[PDB]
Structures are given as structure tokens and as C-alpha cells.
Design an enzyme around this catalytic site. Structure first.
Site, PDB file in Angstrom:
ATOM      1  CB  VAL A  26      66.720  60.693 119.383  1.00  0.00           C
ATOM      2  CG1 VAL A  26      67.281  60.576 120.787  1.00  0.00           C
ATOM      3  CG2 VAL A  26      66.000  62.009 119.209  1.00  0.00           C
ATOM      4  N   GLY A  29      64.754  62.749 109.870  1.00  0.00           N
ATOM      5  CA  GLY A  29      64.044  62.490 108.641  1.00  0.00           C
ATOM      6  C   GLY A  29      64.358  63.522 107.578  1.00  0.00           C
ATOM      7  CB  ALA A  30      62.873  64.197 104.293  1.00  0.00           C
ATOM      8  N   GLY A  32      63.617  67.342 109.223  1.00  0.00           N
ATOM      9  CA  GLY A  32      64.484  67.926 110.227  1.00  0.00           C
ATOM     10  C   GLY A  32      65.245  66.861 110.991  1.00  0.00           C
ATOM     11  CB  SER A  33      68.323  66.847 112.807  1.00  0.00           C
ATOM     12  OG  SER A  33      68.805  66.945 111.475  1.00  0.00           O
ATOM     13  CG  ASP A 164      54.806  62.036 113.743  1.00  0.00           C
ATOM     14  OD1 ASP A 164      55.239  63.010 114.398  1.00  0.00           O
ATOM     15  OD2 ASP A 164      55.519  61.046 113.441  1.00  0.00           O
TER      16      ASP A 164
HETATM   17 MG   LIG Z   1      55.423  59.160 112.579  1.00  0.00          MG
END
Ligand SMILES: [Mg+2]
Ligand SMILES: N#CCC(=O)Nc1ccc(OC(F)(F)F)cc1
Ligand SMILES: [Cl-]
Ligand SMILES: [Cl-]
Ligand SMILES: [Cl-]
Ligand SMILES: [Cl-]
Ligand SMILES: [Cl-]
Length: 348
Positions: A26, A29-30, A32-33, A164
Site C-alpha cells: 500500500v 516511504g524512507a 519502511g514499506s 505518525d
Molecule cells: Mg503522516
């Protein structure tokens, strides 16, 4: 120890316990996947994140430990929590990969504000839930640091979770120009004129609440200085009381170059809004951070009379952050992380 199985998905090897099925990528980023999956033990749809290079440097190793400690602590209805954490390693000596599992999130608040006609009742309920989660976070002496609409998950019943957390991961280039990454940041940290503190999160909540009321970004600056000018036009330039408390010489020099401006009338900015919503915005969007309302104080504001229940707004267990001032080697941060993986106890 569960049985693990391996598969390759988008050129990455995933080795996970059998309980996790139907993995589907889905994003990545930098850090992780991420795959969506079905968890057969709990019946939940989940997000599984494989960390990318978690121990490549001391900085990265400490960041991996910081993220795992934070996620293991957060146990609140309006904050993302940890469903599972695992590694396929059978000992510390072969330990290399870390996987984190959370509830799979659908829409964020970005989708809601631009696609939906919000009543005042919707704004009350959404901002109430942000403040309820923030009271909990701040009671553990944690600062989120990155509150913005894309970090707020919302479902069809208007229920909200904060996610986050800021792990001190944002770079200078990520904050440059016409970018939503900076539009919700408090003025005193935008150019690092003050150290972070929990009042910067309340500034962010004010920016989010204004955007829900109007459908528009409050301070969409094209760069740091354009954004500061938009902020000072609304809330005024610093008065004598606040100026005396500004210690940064870089701040004082630039601020005194600007012509003085009074605070604007918020009833003429937020036309048609509930007068109680306007009153709360004036108490959040205060230039002097000492004087901003706190999350605990804001929950008792009359704007939330429909939802406020002081017997159902819990605080957090104490959170020991002494590791943040500790100096360790890569393999010591790695060993501390391994201990936290194997001691994890899942929620009920
Ligand atoms: Mg975010
Ligand atoms: N120490 C301390 C307090 C302080 O330095 N506060 C502050 C700085 C900068 C601020 O932003 C702006 F310069 F006024 F725009 C607002 C408040
Ligand atoms: Cl399993
Ligand atoms: Cl959760
Ligand atoms: Cl491993
Ligand atoms: Cl956003
Ligand atoms: Cl602790």
C-alpha cells in the site's frame, strides 16, 4: 515462537507469522514499506510495516528504539496503538529486521474537509477527540510535533485517531516552499527560535480547527517568511510583554524590522461561525506560547458541552524518556530494541 513464511512483493522479501494473510502493498516511504493484511488471530484488517535499514547508523538505531518505545506506551481510544511487533530472528546475533503491526486506517481528515459539508456539530466532535487524545499524550510529557490533517485518521462514524508521531525525522528540504508539511507549525519553532514544548501542538490544533470551519488552509505560506507574515497579520506583532521574554537574538533582530500590526477581529475572519468556536480559536492562536490554552483546559470549554465528560478523559501512565540523553553504540541500541520486541504483550 510462531511459524514464519516468506514471499517477495514489489522486490522486497516479507517474512511474517502465518497468522498474517493476503498481504498487499500500500506504500513505501524512507522509513519502511507497508502492506495491508488480514490478521486471522484477531479478525482485524491491519497495516504491517517493515522498517528499512533500522540499525544502519547510531542515529537510525536510536530512532528505531524511540519509535518502538512510543508505540508500546500509547493505550488510548483516540491514539494509534501497537497490535504486534515481530522479528524472524531466533537470537540477538541474527537480529536484523523489525516489523510493526497496527490497525489499518482508511480516510484521513484531508479527505473529509475537502469532500464533505461539515456541520458545527461535526467540528465539535472531531476537535473534541483530538484534544482528548492530546490530554493523554501530554500527560506523559510527550510532544507530538507533527499534527496536521494527513496524520488524523477518521472513519464513517466520525471517530478519530492521532497517528505518525514526530520522531525528529523531517529535513530542511521537506519544510521548504509551498508545502503542507509547514503550514501547521507554530511560529516559534518554524525558524527554531525556541525549543519544542507541548504548547506547539495546541497551535496546530487551532490551524486544523480553522480549516474545518472554512474549508481553506489558514496559513498557506509560500516559504517560511511569507508564512510568518500571514501569521502576524492575524494575531498581531509581539507586544512589549512578549518581546521581553524572547531570548533568541536572531528572532528579535528580524521581528523589530517589521511594522507593528494589531490583532484582527476573529468574528470578521471566521464569518458565520459559532461564537463559541471563535472564542476557542482566540485562546489557541496566541503568539505568546505561555498564554495558550492547554488541552485539559480546552476540554472544559463551553464549545464542547455536548461531549465533555471529566470521568471519561483519561491520563497516561508515566513515560521514562531518560534514554534520549544517553550515548550508546549501535549494537547497544540494537540490543535494547531486541529486548523490547521479545517482551511485547498484546492487548486483550
Ligand atoms: Mg503522516
Ligand atoms: N524563550 C522564550 C519565549 C519565546 O521566544 N517566544 C516566541 C518567539 C518567537 C515567536 O514568534 C514570533 F517571532 F513572534 F513570530 C513567538 C514566541
Ligand atoms: Cl502465526
Ligand atoms: Cl489503535
Ligand atoms: Cl531478522
Ligand atoms: Cl496534511
Ligand atoms: Cl516508561
Amino acid at each position: 515462537r510462531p511459524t514464519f513464511y516468506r514471499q517477495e512483493l514489489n522486490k522486497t522479501i516479507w517474512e511474517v507469522p502465518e497468522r498474517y494473510q493476503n498481504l498487499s502493498p500500500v506504500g513505501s516511504g524512507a522509513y519502511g514499506s507497508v502492506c495491508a493484511a488480514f490478521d486471522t488471530k484477531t479478525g482485524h484488517r491491519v497495516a504491517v510495516k517493515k522498517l528499512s535499514r533500522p540499525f544502519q547508523s547510531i542515529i537510525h538505531a536510536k530512532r528505531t528504539y524511540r519509535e518502538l518505545r512510543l508505540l508500546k506506551h500509547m493505550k488510548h481510544e483516540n491514539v494509534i496503538g501497537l497490535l504486534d511487533v515481530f522479528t524472524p530472528a531466533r537470537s540477538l546475533e541474527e537480529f536484523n529486521d523489525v516489523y510493526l503491526v497496527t490497525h489499518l486506517m482508511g480516510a484521513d481528515l484531508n479527505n473529509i474537509v475537502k469532500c464533505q459539508k461539515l456541520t458545527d456539530d461535526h467540528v465539535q466532535f472531531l476537535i473534541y477527540q483530538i484534544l482528548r487524545g492530546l490530554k493523554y499524550i501530554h500527560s506523559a510529557d510527550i510532544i507530538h510535533r507533527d499534527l496536521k490533517p494527513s496524520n488524523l485518521a477518521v472513519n464513517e462514524d466520525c471517530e478519530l485517531k492521532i497517528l505518525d508521531f514526530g520522531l525528529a525525522r523531517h529535513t530542511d528540504d521537506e519544510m521548504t516552499g509551498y508545502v503542507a508539511t509547514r503550514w501547521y507549525r507554530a511560529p516559534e519553532i518554524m525558524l527554531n527560535w525556541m525549543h519544542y514544548n507541548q504548547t506547539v501542538d495546541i497551535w496546530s490544533v487551532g490551524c486544523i480547527m480553522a480549516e474545518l470551519l472554512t474549508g481553506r488552509t489558514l496559513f498557506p505560506g509560500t516559504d517560511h517568511i511569507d508564512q510568518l507574515k500571514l501569521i502576524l497579520r492575524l494575531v498581531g506583532t509581539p507586544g512589549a510583554e512578549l518581546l521581553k521574554k524572547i531570548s533568541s537574538e536572531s528572532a528579535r533582530n528580524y521581528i523589530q524590522s517589521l511594522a507593528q500590526m494589531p490583532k484582527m477581529n476573529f468574528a470578521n475572519v471566521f464569518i458565520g461561525a459559532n461564537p463559541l468556536a471563535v472564542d476557542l480559536l482566540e485562546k489557541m492562536l496566541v503568539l505568546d506560547s505561555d498564554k495558550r490554552i492547554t488541552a485539559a483546559q480546552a476540554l472544559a470549554h463551553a464549545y464542547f458541552a455536548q461531549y465533555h465528560d471529566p470521568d471519561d478523559e483519561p491520563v497516561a501512565d508515566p513515560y521514562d524518556q531518560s534514554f534520549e540523553s544517553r550515548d550508546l553504540l549501535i549494537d547497544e541500541w540494537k540490543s535494547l530494541t531486541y529486548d523490547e520486541v521479545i517482551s511485547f504483550v498484546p492487548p486483550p
